[PDB]
Structures are given as structure tokens and as C-alpha cells.
Design a protein around this ligand. Sequence first.
Ligand SMILES: Cc1cn([C@H]2C=C[C@@H](COP(=O)(O)O)O2)c(=O)[nH]c1=O
Ligand SMILES: Cc1cn([C@H]2C=C[C@@H](COP(=O)(O)O)O2)c(=O)[nH]c1=O
Ligand SMILES: [Mg+2]
Ligand SMILES: [Mg+2]
Ligand SMILES: [Mg+2]
Ligand SMILES: [Mg+2]
Lengths: 194, 194
Amino acid sequence: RALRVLVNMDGVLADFEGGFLRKFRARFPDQPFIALEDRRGFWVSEQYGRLRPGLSEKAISIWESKNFFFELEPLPGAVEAVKEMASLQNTDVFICTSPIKMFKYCPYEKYAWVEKYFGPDFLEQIVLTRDKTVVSADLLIDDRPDITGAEPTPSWEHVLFTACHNQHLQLQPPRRRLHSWADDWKAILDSKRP
Amino acid sequence: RALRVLVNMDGVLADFEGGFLRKFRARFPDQPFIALEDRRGFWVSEQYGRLRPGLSEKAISIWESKNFFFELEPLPGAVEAVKEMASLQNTDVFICTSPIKMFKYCPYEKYAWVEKYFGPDFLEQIVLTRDKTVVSADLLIDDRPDITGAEPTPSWEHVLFTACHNQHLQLQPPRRRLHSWADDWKAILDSKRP
Ligand SMILES: Cc1cn([C@H]2C=C[C@@H](COP(=O)(O)O)O2)c(=O)[nH]c1=O
Ligand SMILES: Cc1cn([C@H]2C=C[C@@H](COP(=O)(O)O)O2)c(=O)[nH]c1=O
Ligand SMILES: [Mg+2]
Ligand SMILES: [Mg+2]
Ligand SMILES: [Mg+2]
Ligand SMILES: [Mg+2]
């Protein structure tokens, strides 16, 4: 009855790519790096690892470090759009995010980030999971192309949120994109309503 | 195709009631307390609050304190049963747990607890959410009687795990219980398979 929308955090709400590149360059100023226009594929670690031996591990250490997640900047229009989306009649919004393997900071910082931008009351809307296919909803807005897990037939339609790593990707019909938060997300939502 | 089972953490895997009572008594030795046989209703804070003014807040401070979640003891048979359950053919097990409002320690400690008892590889099977009805599965084993949220018709059957606070409760047919991990959980699982 209410339309349910899952909104991914990294690469959709939070600027993981920009914050990573900045911190990587400051920490490792003598290593080569991947400019955002050159990013391809979801896994930053795999691309950096192909660039040079040992770079995978150095990339991983950036997001394993304290304050990495907390200090991510919101992507343009993300906060405003999700706030309006959640205020819409017959619309329930959840933030669906995958923590990393190292769990000392990431869970905590992700809660703190959501509190900071959306307020205490929005914390109730967070789902942390490595498997999104077991979360049921009408829509999932997420920048990762390949979303898989234990449920072979997820209830949501995956709308690919555009990011540097996926912008060149040709999708198979009928898969569809949300180009940025300036794009017409209301029309995508409305297309799933009765 | 695989049977999917969500197993709650507090009151099912982890002995929240016992660990709370112990820590409450050590910290507040001059307050009255609720013996486990006298516990009624899911909310410890509400019962303690009816016992005396100010006790709700003192109860809350126990589980808000560092190491509360981490130092919970496993309930008898819980670790062994979940390990066997996850090893079964055509069976995917997730640990589904609701964090508290105060998020500095609880998320982190819950990951650490699961690592401690089930190993690093089991961390992938954790879903943190305040709303279990948006997690899809065949079964949810959970000690809280009233499980509600945004999805009015959850895909799972809720099997009530017995606890001090619910043991006297008469359920409405066809709702059903798992009495403890010594009870025949395999038969409940098998009843949901093709
Ligand atoms: C790009 C990248 C990300 N991650 C972790 C860090 C944050 C989450 C982002 O996953 P998401 O919830 O946005 O699907 O995965 C990785 O573990 N490796 C990587 O290469
Ligand atoms: C008993 C009790 C528990 N909680 C929090 C602490 C741990 C989780 C347990 O929720 P569960 O995932 O077991 O449904 O809720 C509370 O916030 N208040 C209470 O009175
Ligand atoms: Mg993402
Ligand atoms: Mg709404
Ligand atoms: Mg419980
Ligand atoms: Mg199995």
C-alpha cells in the first residue's frame, strides 16, 4: 500500500568516490591514482590493484581508517531529495547500506552521518546488510550494477544511480537509471504506484 | 529455492535478560529489580518504570553502556544450533537484530559478538534494522510477540522464541513457538520446505 523505496548510501547519498580520491592522494602523494572520469567498475580496490601491485591494500586502508565514512560529503541534491521523498504521502524510504568487513568504525559512522544530515528520527530508516536482495521494497536506487545475494528474485526494481564507475555502462533493457538527484526521481517513483 | 531463516539476536542468541539483570544489580545494588520469573512484556524499561519512578532511565543506561552487548553470554544451544542450521543443505540463515537509539557501541559490539561465536565469515549474514517486516524470508525466530513495521504482510512466518517475558503469553492460532534451542527447530524448518 505505501510505496517502499530503498536508497543506497555510498555512491548515492554519500560521495564515496570523491572522498576516497581526496584522502588517497593526501595520504599517498607518490602513488598513481585513478581520476574519477577514468573510474570503471564498482570495486575501487580491484581497479587500483590493476594499476599497480600493493595499491589494492593501500586503497582499502583509506576506507578502513577512522572518519572516512563520517566525513563523506553528501552528493548534490541527495539530502534535499530524500527528505522530500520521505515526506511524500504513501511513501516509505529506507537507507540501505553495506558495511565493510572491518567493523570498528563503519557501522557507527554511517549512523552518525545519517543523524547529521537527516536528524535522529531518520535513524529508524537504516538497514545495514551485505545482502540487499533479502530486503523487500518496490524500488532500490543503487550505483552498483550487479546486485545479487540469497534471494534470486528480489521484490524491488533496481534503478541504477549514475556514478563515474558506471556512467559508460550499457544496461540490458528494461533496466533504467536515475541520472543524479537533479533527475526526475518523482517520475520513477510514480511509475511504480497503482 | 533455499529456505531462508532470520534468527533474532537479543533474547534468542544472546542472553539480554540475564546480562541486563546482572549488570543492573551490580550497578544499582540499592534499587529494586525484576527477577527473570517475574518479567512480563518485551520492554524491560517499561516494566522497570512501573516498578519505580526513575528506573526506566537507570535500566536504559545499562544497555547504553560500553561492553553491554559484547559481554552477553550465548543462550544454551544457540551457537551450536545456528551453526548446524546454516550448514544444512538448501538453508540460508541471517542474524536479524535491532540496534538501540544510541549507536556508539551497539552496532560495533554486535558485529564483534557474531565474529567471536560464529567466525569472520558469518558477518556477511547480519542484517541490522529497526524494521524486520521489510526483511523477506520463510521464517523469523524472535522473542518479541508483536513484530510490526512498514510492510503490513511480511513474507516470513514469525515463530515466537520463548523467553521469561513471553512464556505465559497465550498466542492466537496458528502462531507457534520454538521453546528453546533444545526444542526441535529442524522440524519447524522442515515444515516450511517443499
Ligand atoms: C568501492 C568499494 C567499496 N567497498 C565497501 C565500502 C563501502 C561499501 C559500499 O557498498 P554499497 O552499500 O554502496 O553497495 O562497500 C569495498 O569493500 N571495496 C570497494 O572497492
Ligand atoms: C528489552 C529492551 C530492549 N531494547 C533494545 C536493545 C536491544 C534490542 C533488542 O531488540 P530485538 O532485536 O531482540 O527485537 O532492543 C530497548 O530499547 N528497550 C528494552 O526495553
Ligand atoms: Mg553504493
Ligand atoms: Mg512518507
Ligand atoms: Mg529479541
Ligand atoms: Mg546452508
